[PDB]
């Protein structure tokens, strides 16, 4: 998953079992995500 960096705190408060597995990214200017989706 990738989410705005300005929301990151809520992603680091959910119960741990829900969070296990998936990797996360965080960003503010879209030019970063464009360098993620197409490595």
């Amino acid at each position: 998953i990738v989410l705005p960096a300005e929301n990151k705190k809520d992603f680091y408060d959910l119960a741990a079992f829900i969070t296990e597995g998936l990797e996360v990214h965080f960003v503010e200017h879209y030019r970063e995500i464009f360098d993620i989706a197409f490595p």
């Binding site: 300005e6 705190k9 680091y12 408060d13 503010e28």
Partner: protein, 50 residues
């Protein structure tokens, strides 16, 4: 108004840590604040420098 609710929450989660908690004197300090309120709900001030 919202400041009212958050100060109320601080006092409340303090009292629970007195009625049974080891501490008999809560003293919030900026380092300690997380424990009672969790991580900040805001960090940016303006949406960015122009």
């Amino acid at each position: 108004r919202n400041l009212q609710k958050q100060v109320e929450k601080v006092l409340r989660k303090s009292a629970y840590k007195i009625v049974s908690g080891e501490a008999e004197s809560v003293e919030v300090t900026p380092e300690n604040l997380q424990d009672f309120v969790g991580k900040p709900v805001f960090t940016v001030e303006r949406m960015y420098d122009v």
